[PDB]
Every structure is written in structure tokens, then in C-alpha cells.
Amino acid sequence: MRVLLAPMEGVLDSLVRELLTEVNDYDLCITEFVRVVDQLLPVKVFHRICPELQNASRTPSGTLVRVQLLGQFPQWLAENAARAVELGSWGVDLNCGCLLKDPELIYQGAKAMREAVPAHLPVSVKVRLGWDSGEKKFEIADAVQQAGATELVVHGRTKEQGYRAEHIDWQAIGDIRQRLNIPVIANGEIWDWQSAQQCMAISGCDAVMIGRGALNIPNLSRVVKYNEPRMPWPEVVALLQKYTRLEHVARIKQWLSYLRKEYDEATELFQHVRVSPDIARAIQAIDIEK
């Protein structure tokens, strides 16, 4: 089984990647997107989004990270893809879900990137089922394969369905997988060991990507792969303590907000820390127990 850590712009950055990968077995993390328009972005932008590039594309604990690009113009997707790779990125990812209601644009963008990235390095594309309909989710999928992309992440909802749980369609992901000859990584609504098993049995995918769930349960990759139990609240606290010592984070409150769905003890700690960065002391104060 492969488990990928999703890109979560405004939630996951290099610090949380280093934190999480330490206590997980993610096969690969995708960075938050590098926004591409019509310019080659400076080296400094890539290093800042992806500090791992200077560590052979790995978090300190050794988990691979891949730079993601977001954009439309194939020429510039290609030049930025080449630069990502020159700087050390283990392949490059293309965001087509945060998007493109034209399979031709996905085809051209991914192709330019494939040709611009050294053939032995992966070029992956992340998509949704469709814009306002999942009709010809095959067109999109065909586009990606025909472009020469290495693998396809499919978020099992259309753009309009947003993040509504009742709209997740793992079977659609399966129909795409049956049709293609590159790996399909199932994404969306994977929260625990059982939902992962349900997803893979229905889609037939042996690879999944987890986003929001990876914050609700900090060791979700090990939960999914090994049916490890969820990380114990004292360990979560110990982890949030380590987070404070990694150095300005208001993402801490955001994380605690995520943790409220799974850990009862998080709702009180959320209220405490909600309402200056003395929050560091408050968190660092707690004795583990309990």
C-alpha cells in the first residue's frame, strides 16, 4: 500500500511535514502549490516552499517530498517544472483540482512538464472528477495518461460538490483506474483504517492520498497501513509541544481545531489557547499523564 500526504495550502507546510513524517510512514508528501502564471519563479521561492530540496527532496526523517505547480500556460509550467527538478525535487506534481474544465489544457500542461522533466523522474497530476459534472471524467483521465504523466491523483468529487462527505465517489475512481495504465491514487474522505480499506476495496487502488484526516489523526499513515491505533492524546500534546519549539504559528490553533473532531480533550485545549503567542508556554507547560 502507498500512502501520500496531500498538499494542504494554509495548513501543511515544511514544519508540519517534518513533524508528521517523523511519526508516520508516508511514502511521499506533496508541497503546497507553487503558483505559476507567465514567469520563471526565482530559486528562493522554491527553497522557501520546499526546504527539503536542499536535503535531497526529503524531510529530515527521510520522507520524500514533491513540489507541486499550479497554472495554465504550458510554457511556464515546463520552465518552472525544470527548475523544481534542477533544485532537487523528486519529480513534479500538477494541480488540476483547486480548476481546469478543459481536458485539452490539462493535456498541454502535463505534456510540457513531462517533456521538461527528465524522463526517469515522475510527473504526477492531481484532478477532481469534473467541474459541475463527473461526465467524461475519462476525458480528463485520458488527457493525463496521453500526456505521459507518471500517475494520477483523483479527488473523488466534482468541483461543485466541494468537500461534502455524501458526495465522495470511490467507485468513479475505480472506473478511471480500470481504464488507465498508470497508478491512480484515491483521494477524499479517508479518515481511518476502515475507511481506507473501504476506499481501496471499491476503487481497487493500492495507493491513497490523505489530506484533512492527517491532521485529525497525526499518525494516520500508520493507522491506515498497519491498523495502528490512533495516536494517544498525551502523544498528540507532546507533538504540539514539539511544534512550538520548531523555530510564530497560528496554525497551532488551526490544528487544535482539527483535533476536536477526533479527540475530546482537544475541545477544552482549543478554548484555552483561543484568546499573543504565550500559547507556546501554555502548551509547553502541560505535564503528559493523564
Ligand X SMILES: Cc1cc2nc3c(=O)[nH]c(=O)nc-3n(C[C@H](O)[C@H](O)[C@H](O)COP(=O)(O)O)c2cc1C
Q: Which residues are annotated as a binding site for FMN?
A: 7-9, 68, 126, 187-189, 211-212
CB of 163 or CB of 226, closer to ligand X: 163
- Check binding of 155 to ligand X (CB under 6 A): yes
Residue 1 or residue 238: which is nearer to ligand X going by CB? 1
| Choice between 96 and 237, CB closer to ligand X | 96
Task: Please list every residue from 182 through 221 that binds ligand X, using CB under 6 A.
Answer: 187-190, 210-213
Question: Catalytic: 98?
Answer: yes
Can residue 225 be called a binding residue for ligand X (CB under 6 A)? no
Of the listed 29, 50, 96, 98, which one is catalytic?
Answer: 98
Q: Is 97 in the site for ligand X (CB under 6 A)?
A: yes
What is the DSSP secondary-structure string of the chain? Answer: -EEEEPP-TTT--HHHHHHHHHTS--SEEEEEEEE-SSSPPPHHHHHHH-GGGGGTTB-TT--BEEEEEE-S-HHHHHHHHHHHHHTT-SSEEEEE------HHHHHHHHHHHHHHS-TTS-EEEEEES-SS--TTHHHHHHHHHHTT-SEEEEESS-STTTT-GGG--HHHHHHHHHH-SS-EEEESS--SHHHHHHHHHHH--SEEEESTHHHHSTTHHHHHHH-PPPPPHHHHHHHHHHHHH----SHHHHHHHHHTTT-THHHHHHHHH---TTHHHHHHH-----
- Binding ligand X (rule: CB under 6 A), the pick from 37, 43, 98, 282 is 98
Binding mask 28-67 for ligand X (x = CB under 6 A): ----xx----------------------------------
Minimum separation from the CB atom of position 101 to ligand X (A):
16
Binding residues for ligand X (CB under 6 A): 6-11, 32-33, 68, 95, 97-98, 126, 155, 187-190, 210-213
